[PDB]
């Protein structure tokens, strides 16, 4: 357990070494092993992969990613395939419970995210806690394994982690980069005729869709079917349904992939392309760091991405998806350029990725100091300075400025030992940023004074996150909804801070500039709009209805789903620890309702992993109002309900599943839950 | 009327030419003459001087200074001896009423205040408006006159104003300067033996009082009585009474003068020193720019003033008070120094005053743009650039940044042509700073939603100014008062924003740092404390009771009186112009109540200038519940009531007035009011 850090290009079986190491460590030490992943989609896919590969050895595999969580305690688990943000909370609770020795290893995937990123600092703190605790309390304590592409400072990361080094540039499908700048239809025909797929990357969502549409149009003009019809039917029966453009585009071996779609539609398209059913796929920058989806020929619409040169890291991870290891011999990554874009393309062709930064007065150092002090691992000044040396910023005097910020905001109490009073303890357990915890504390305390129980809107407003701009708000439609709102919802609107004057300013006048820090009251109205969307969401209204009523597309609504559910869980833990029992009770149900977008009655029924929001309503309408009830039922009954050999349903990480055996597994999983 | 600018040292009749100029202009053109003064005390003194000197020519002389105002329209007036703040409002209302030609002269006193100062910018804008309006609409339009000490750039100011120049350093009592190295006992003894006064200047207040006390003690130990006893009795019968230290210090020809005293006590001491009854006077930096109070020998405790070298302009105006024109031969100024202070003293001995700045993104330019736009004198962009050239900053591109700031805050509406909608018109007529008018608008609009009429506290909170730190707040006593507050007062406290949590933080914990702009909620609690003080003030409780209950001394309470009354008047005009009739009605009575610190019943009775807060209660208790009633009464009745040849009462600008003839003037003035 001397730790380890290694890098290798993707599409080269580079995760296999991690699988072997984790198997060895869990089987030998009988201790846990966190598998940290950047994104929730890749975390889900890796969790399914590890479940399949380690089911036959009595190894439990269930991670903490997104808003979801395992239905069993952390003790029973053996491998937790968590995301970066939730792995930090896992380690924090282990430290606070003084059960740190339960961990045997911590694998980290795609370590290049350590640098410039809005989540890498969480990875930095997460690994710093491990190194600090290992060195304070000791050969075979906690192994760390990392992955990345060709990092200019990989050896530096290994030195920080006190781990070995392995860097190699090898792939079974040698890529051939060749820039080139009529013959468009000829190129399309010659690439498609070879029986090989094409993965095109386009920055703009609308232009990506139109490009896929016109590729399908050219194929239709110049012009397996059963499996493609199966994919048609699978797309048809979805909560959002089938898109008009996608319907015409899919049956000519052309598809598109962007955040605008739902997670389920993205899964359908990814599976269709991976199986080879889809030949041409116009994806966007989102897929670049997404699930493993190799192709034969990669193409890029243009270096320009969002009014700027494309990130070199994005290009590096894009090229990895050009070549299939096992069926393909060679792979290509073509990059069209223009006269003015020739220089940008040439610059992008050469040069590896930029160095890894740290991103640490900054809120990250406040979070770090809070973690260490509340955890009880750095209580006095003498040792908190060693934590600075433990970090990657050091290995590559702001602590005092942060420590005072915490005492200024009463997060901790000085004694010269330090301790948390109540808000620091509740802030670390909730995994909330200490910067926003003061605002959350004020909003919760204000809410409990005059809480509105007539509807869920006041509860939703308090579990509505607004740390990112999840969508652009149309203030005219928002004013229409406001004037159409019931009075019960308007009482909470007045309570929170919404004013008809501000909406009147925004409906006609240009969006008011928030030049001054005092204009956080612009965030109040955006928060109220988002909370109304979330109320329509948990009311179980179709995504299309929420789209027309509010203008946010289904992909944005699903991202809001996940963010709101995660925030609701965090706020529930915050309230639980703060001693606010009534607030905790009112908030508890909302995490699951937000995760699944379901009513209170379906909450006891979505405990079965194989039950969507629609598949929970159909069973509830039939009479299965509880998982125990759903266990006591024959397979043919559920089969006929689902209907009212062909794979038509879809579930995350599915197999040759149809309406027949899907009903068989629904009842079987219900039995296991009981 | 070719304007004029001149400078000359004080104690040389520099103001004399002003009186002749005003007399000539007012008698010839029959137009008005605004005499602008820096401070309210000097404005009062000059108003009384001009009244005495021009009563025998049938000319009205009543100025707008402090919270007070004439009891007759501006039309009937001939000379308005206003202060800088209120002269700007006079000019603004003249411009808005398009009656600018009514003015014939604008004399300005102590023009060096135009530079670095928290009020000089108002003088700058006031003078800029006159020159702009004269040049757009024409050589007898409006004459301008100025005064100051030896300004390094007097010619520059004259060039800005397009006026002549006269600068001379002459004084009938030549001041000497020859350093000869506390050692004040013999110096004071030899000076007092010569039958000459001494004016000592001390930076600190408590140490100034102790310095007066020790000098009185040495005079008592080592070393007219009827007039000094008269001054004793005059000090005895005051709302604040007589200080313990002042009682023991006054009868040995020693007194002290600082902002801690009341305006009345300051007036008593100044009169006693001017008459020669007081020989030694320990004043502070406040008196340096105060009323004319010449002395034979000036002394300064130390160049260090407030932890820094004494301002050179302050020293220049101090030394002017060393020499009496007509009874003195040669005046002296002695500046004691030390080993470390020798360098500072020699530095301060040499070098005249610094050059005059302009102090013009800045709120001053926002105010200027607002004034010119709603005045209708600068509507289109083309001419607003000329205003910039008209300024003293120019004569010695931020307009666009300010113009957008006004449109950003909806102060004006764009059309090529700019106009005010409602808030700009109400802001300029209210003479409020447009920076704070947004907060005032928010607080007023919020108040009308949930107004509390049970007591005056909610009305006082809205007319409580907090633009300066009028006193240091003791949060322990404030918490005690909060505990003892009635529920009616606590409802308004909750409405405004006061929270028991913040007071709990402040009572024991150190004063919370307002590092963040979002912590204006510290100003809410200071505002509430000040409003409670103001409520006790208008409840007609003695100043000593307010001092013990709140800790603010009587001088601070009187400064708060004046500031709160001025702010109440401004807010009343703001509400009047905004169309808020109920708010205006509730606010109207409060300006006079704050000015005099009286109840509603005495408001109709303090219309007589001779009547004070105490002298209005004694008559009201007798039965004179109205000025008309007070007119219908014999002189002996009021004489006996006042009692229940010796000058015992005091009133601003008094004469050989006693209890007998004071009653005679009270009834006589009441008749004139009717
Ligand atoms: C408490 O914050 C959350 C609550 N809800 C959700 Cl949906 C998401 C979050 C969240 C949001 N943003 C960042 C991080 C988190 C997060 O940290 N989430 C966690 N999920 N599971 C955790 C461990 C609690 C379990 C535990 C119990 C015993 C032992 C032992 N021995 C070890 C671990 S923490
Ligand atoms: C409206 O602001 C105030 C109200 N209350 C008070 Cl106690 C003080 C103020 C104040 C505070 N800080 C700065 C300036 C002011 C201020 O502007 N004070 C004034 N008070 N009266 C004035 C003349 C307005 C009237 C007028 C002028 C010309 C003609 C003609 N022809 C007719 C009427 S201006």
Swiss-Prot record, chains A, B:
Tissues where the protein occurs: Highly expressed in testis.
Native source species: Homo sapiens (Human)
Residue window of motif DEAH box: 109-112
Ranges where the Helicase C-terminal domain occurs: 182-388
Domain of life of the native organism: Eukaryota
All copies of domain Helicase ATP-binding, residue ranges: 1-169
Complex formation: Homomultimer; forms homodimers and homotetramers. Interacts with RAD51. Interacts with ORC2 and ORC4. Interacts with RHNO1; interaction takes place during mitosis and promotes POLQ recruitment to DNA damage sites. Interacts (when phosphorylated) with TOPBP1 (via BRCT domains 7 and 8); promoting POLQ recruitment to DNA damage sites.
Protein name: DNA polymerase theta
Disulfide topology: none
Family: Belongs to the DNA polymerase type-A family.
Record's disease association: Breast cancer: A common malignancy originating from breast epithelial tissue. Breast neoplasms can be distinguished by their histologic pattern. Invasive ductal carcinoma is by far the most common type. Breast cancer is etiologically and genetically heterogeneous. Important genetic factors have been indicated by familial occurrence and bilateral involvement. Mutations at more than one locus can be involved in different families or even in the same case.
Name of the gene: POLQ
